[PDB]
Design a protein around this ligand. Structure first.
Ligand code: BEF
Ligand SMILES: [Mg+2]
Length: 273
């Protein structure tokens, strides 16, 4: 546990900004799980709960949620048995969203009036990384158009930041018809990582990596990195804590239980940069 974590961080310190890159999840990793006693929304929830979606549709999304979430957290099932149900889940949700006919124009309003919140310390996080031109690869199974507007309106969509997620596909009217590329969901981030080899091949020298996640599946996000000399994995354990603590402890290097800040990441960066 602790000696190894320190030997990784020392590796990171020695390499400095010159060798560093960040790979990180968005939902519940950069954004908060809860705030002042209320649950906070995922990207998908921002759209689910906004003015441009009817109640009957919001009912149907909740019916899906409790059908498929129950299957997702099901302990008995191996992750490959769950894999099709997850694929089925994301398709129907987007299917329901596509029928609502979301205007691209409205997205900035929806995010503006949402309950979304980035973790405490995010300004320091993004600004320090921008200052030293550290590449940031945000890799999310949410909605790209939503995510982008959150960090844009927060003032931290700097030029070093790359976003890979499920992006919306609009018609000639600017009305949503579907989603682009191949679906990114909770269990298949290994595939997306290898698909972005073009990006990582340009950062061969950046052999020091910090990976921030909140699910088990986020552990695969560095499978496309060209050269790995040192990698540190910081994991936010926000929910299902008693069930998953042992397991997170055995796979992430630093486990932060119900921690709504980035101050551990920030403190480590202060040392490296
Ligand atoms: F954005 Be991650 F997929 F939660
Ligand atoms: Mg997440």
């Amino acid at each position: 546990n602790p000696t190894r974590v320190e030997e990784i961080i020392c590796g990171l310190i020695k390499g400095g900004a010159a060798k560093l890159q960040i790979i990180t999840d968005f939902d519940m990793t950069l954004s908060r799980f809860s705030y002042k006693g209320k649950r906070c929304p995922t990207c998908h929830n921002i759209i689910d709960n906004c003015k441009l979606v009817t109640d009957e549709c919001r009912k149907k999304l909740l019916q899906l949620k409790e059908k498929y979430y129950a299957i997702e957290v099901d302990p008995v099932l191996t992750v490959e048995e769950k894999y099709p149900y997850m694929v089925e889940w994301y398709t129907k949700s987007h299917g329901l969203l596509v029928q609502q006919a979301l205007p691209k124009a409205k997205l900035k309003e929806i995010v503006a009036e949402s309950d979304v919140m980035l973790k405490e310390g995010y300004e320091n996080f993004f600004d320090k990384l921008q200052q030293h031109s550290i590449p940031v690869f945000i890799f999310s199974a949410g909605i790209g158009d939503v995510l982008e507007e959150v960090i844009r309106q927060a003032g931290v969509y700097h030029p070093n930041v790359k976003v890979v997620s499920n992006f919306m596909d609009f018609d000639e009217t600017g009305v949503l018809k579907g989603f682009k590329g191949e679906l990114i969901h909770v269990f298949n981030k290994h595939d997306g990582a290898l698909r972005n080899t073009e990006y990582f091949n340009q950062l061969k020298d950046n052999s020091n990596i910090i990976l921030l996640g909140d699910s088990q599946g986020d552990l695969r996000m560095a499978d496309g990195v060209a050269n790995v000399e040192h990698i540190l994995k910081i994991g936010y354990l926000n929910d299902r804590v008693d069930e998953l603590l042992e397991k997170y402890m055995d796979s992430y290097d630093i486990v932060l239980v119900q921690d709504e800040s980035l101050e551990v990441a920030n403190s480590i960066l202060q040392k490296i940069l």
